[PDB]
Subunit: 22 residues, 20 copies
């Protein structure tokens, strides 16, 4: 995955962990 | 369950214990 | 359930517990 | 259900609980 | 239902609950 | 169980012990 | 996906997580 | 999709999420 | 779709979302 | 895995350990 | 403010936020 | 603030946070 | 603060932390 | 502080530690 | 500036950058 | 700045960097 | 400090030690 | 700075480094 | 600095070292 | 310094040693 795609996936993943919704 | 759903279930459960109506 | 739907279900459920009418 | 429809259903439901007529 | 139709249905429904005539 | 779920289960369990209703 | 498309998908995804509607 | 088309789709999508009507 | 056609479709779509009549 | 991907995996993993949700 | 007045103010306020014109 | 007024303020506040316009 | 007011403040505060806008 | 207020403060505090924004 | 005014300013600004005539 | 205003400023700024005309 | 307050302080303190941010 | 503002500043800064025009 | 701000500063700093332009 | 800040400083420092540019 390109850098920008990694970064967006990372933020989305962390928020999913915080909200319990991954 | 997501965080918000857990939180609502928790409050509902405690109130049910206090009112004897779970 | 989406956030807003959870919130409304939560309030409706608590009121039902308080009024003994769930 | 859309937001506005949820909101109206919510208010209608609560009033039904208060009046014992859901 | 469109917004305006929802709004009218909502008010009609609440009045029906208040008057016991839904 | 995730942390938040453990915490809610813990509080619910203790209250059940205090009220004799687990 | 191109940069602009990634960015829009990212914002849409985060909002979906916040509103519980992805 | 071209830039302008992406932008319009993005705004339409976000509004749909906010109104619960996508 | 050409720019002007996109723009008109966009405004029409948003208004339809706001009025619940798309 | 490249550096940036490692870093994101690391942070995601630690948060999962802290929240008990890996 | 009475219920109906609140409701109208609420919808007017939200639309103002969506259109950036409050 | 009464319940209904709180609820409307809450939704208005959240939307303001999402749109960056509180 | 009453329960409902606490709950709304809590959700508003968390969203502010997530969006970096408290 | 009452139980519910403690609980909300706790979650808000932990999130602030995770996001580095207390 | 309201949403529609922002949008028009945005498109006008971009075209000015492309044509070198802002 | 509100979200939509940020987004437009961002795109305008990037294009200015690409065209060397900020 | 009451039990629940101790427990929350404990978890907050440990997380602060793990993140180096007490 | 709020999250969205940080993100836009970040992308703008990186592009400025790549183009030698910060 | 909050987590997200640290992360962006980190990436910006590393790129500056790689390009010799900090 | 908090953990995350240490980690970023560490990586930045090592890269500076490798590139001879601390």
């Amino acid at each position: 995955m390109e850098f920008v795609a990694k970064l967006f996936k990372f933020f989305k993943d962390l928020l999913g962990k915080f909200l319990g919704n991954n």
